[PDB]
Design a protein around this ligand. Structure first.
Ligand SMILES: CN(C)Cc1ccc(-c2cnc(NCc3cccc4c3OCC4)n3cnnc23)cc1
Ligand SMILES: [Cl-]
Ligand SMILES: [Cl-]
Lengths: 364, 29
């Protein structure tokens, strides 16, 4: 049975009054340094610092030059040469912006997606590898050190509709993506082809060659299934070698490609079987665009619902029914919680809402 | 168990990431 308990210590509302779609704590900050998180919504990116007695301190507010931009996602990284933190943001315009979080200057941007970007993810070992997932049906892998487009995951056997989410596994050997076509697709990046494409993106030097960098066009995934959910799949994360994914059926499904005993690294691209291992049930979260999250150690799973409830499960409890923690509710938190983020040490859980409100829950 | 085996993979792989993070000194925001 779960023992995790939390207390709501603070809340605030951003003055733009627009829905907040993204929230991320900076997990790159070193131990002892202040806990910082970013929020995204409207044409805004806002940074906050967490302090004692539930204090949420406003640090900087970025306002995009384009008033019609709607940010949907953000992700933290660091400059591998100077150790400086960096923040990537993207949304409806289909443009990735790399912002210096200390000054709020847009350092650089990446154009190429034919439509909106639904999610950004940085590789867990290499801070220069940025993955973007888009309404154009494709995923794109970028090397932000050399400003190159490494690979485009899409085409013949890629997604047939908007890609809503994606996740790298813990060691960054593979990606699972999902979207509106009801499918979950695996893309290995530790293949000889992709490891060489990544190495080539590092050798690319414009002041040494006049030819443009050639991106890989990966048309075929390493696994594909439409047998987990019967509707859009708007969130996917790895849980070790297993997968967590959700649709609108008020359940997060824990599953794995192949039969029960099949090794993730030995499944063939034509594998037609899937194994469901369990379901984390909840209520009132049957609307699209509702993200679940986990803490760094993958000991807690969190998901907000359409009426302001925040569900939490203890992932160290094998049966998902006994894994359920006490649901986090506040009588004033009544709008849809689009995304949550735990601090690196799991001591703080932040939730962001459709009414521009931010809620801080501290672990007891 | 499938559970204990998967939990052990998560424990060892997050420990690898945690050690890589411990060696780093990223500037605060
Ligand atoms: C204002 N209300 C009443 C209407 C409304 C309008 C836009 C979206 C929306 C959110 N988000 C994205 N994408 C990012 C994304 C993908 C998956 C899961 C989540 C996401 O962010 C929140 C959690 N959108 C893309 N196109 N419209 C979106 C949602 C609702
Ligand atoms: Cl992040
Ligand atoms: Cl191909």
């Amino acid at each position: 049975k779960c023992k995790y308990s939390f207390k709501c210590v603070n809340s605030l509302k951003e003055d733009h009054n627009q829905p907040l779609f993204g929230v991320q704590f900076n997990w790159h900050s070193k131990e002892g340094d202040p806990l910082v998180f970013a929020t995204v919504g409207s044409n805004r990116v806002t940074l906050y610092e967490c302090h004692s007695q539930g204090e949420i301190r406003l640090l900087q507010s970025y306002v995009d030059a384009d008033a019609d931009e709607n940010f949907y996602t953000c992700a933290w990284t660091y400059d591998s040469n100077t150790s400086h933190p960096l923040l990537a943001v993207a949304g409806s315009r289909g443009i990735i912006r790399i912002i210096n979080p200390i000054t709020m200057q847009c350092i650089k941007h990446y154009v190429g997606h034919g439509n909106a970007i639904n999610e950004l993810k940085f590789h867990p070992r290499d801070p220069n590898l940025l993955l973007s997932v888009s309404k154009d049906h494709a995923l794109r892998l970028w090397n932000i050190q050399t400003d190159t487009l490494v690979a485009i995951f899409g085409g013949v056997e890629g997604h047939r509709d908007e890609v809503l989410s994606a996740d790298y596994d813990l060691l960054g050997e593979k990606i699972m993506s999902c979207g509106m076509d009801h499918s979950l697709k695996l893309w290995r990046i530790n293949s000889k082809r992709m490891m060489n494409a990544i190495k080539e993106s590092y050798d690319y030097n414009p002041n040494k060659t006049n030819r443009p960098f050639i991106s890989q066009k990966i048309h075929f995934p390493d696994f594909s299934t439409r047998d987990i959910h019967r509707n859009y799949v708007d969130c996917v994360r790895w849980l070790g070698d297993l997968i967590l994914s959700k649709s609108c059926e008020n359940a997060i499904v824990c599953w794995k490609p192949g039969k029960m005993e099949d090794d993730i690294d030995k499944i063939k691209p034509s594998e037609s079987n899937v194994t469901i291992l369990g379901r984390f049930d909840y209520s009132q979260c049957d609307i699209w665009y509702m993200r679940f999250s986990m803490d760094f150690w993958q000991k807690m799973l969190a998901l907000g619902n359409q009426v302001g409830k925040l569900y939490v499960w203890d992932l160290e409890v094998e049966d998902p029914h006994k894994a359920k923690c006490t649901t986090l509710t506040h009588h004033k938190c009544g709008a849809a919680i689009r995304q949550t983020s735990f601090s690196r040490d799991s001591s703080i859980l932040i939730a962001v809402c459709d009414d521009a409100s931010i809620w801080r829950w501290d672990r007891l | 168990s499938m559970f204990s085996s998967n939990r052990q993979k998560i424990l060892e792989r997050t420990e690898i990431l945690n050690q890589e993070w411990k060696q780093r000194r990223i500037q605060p925001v």
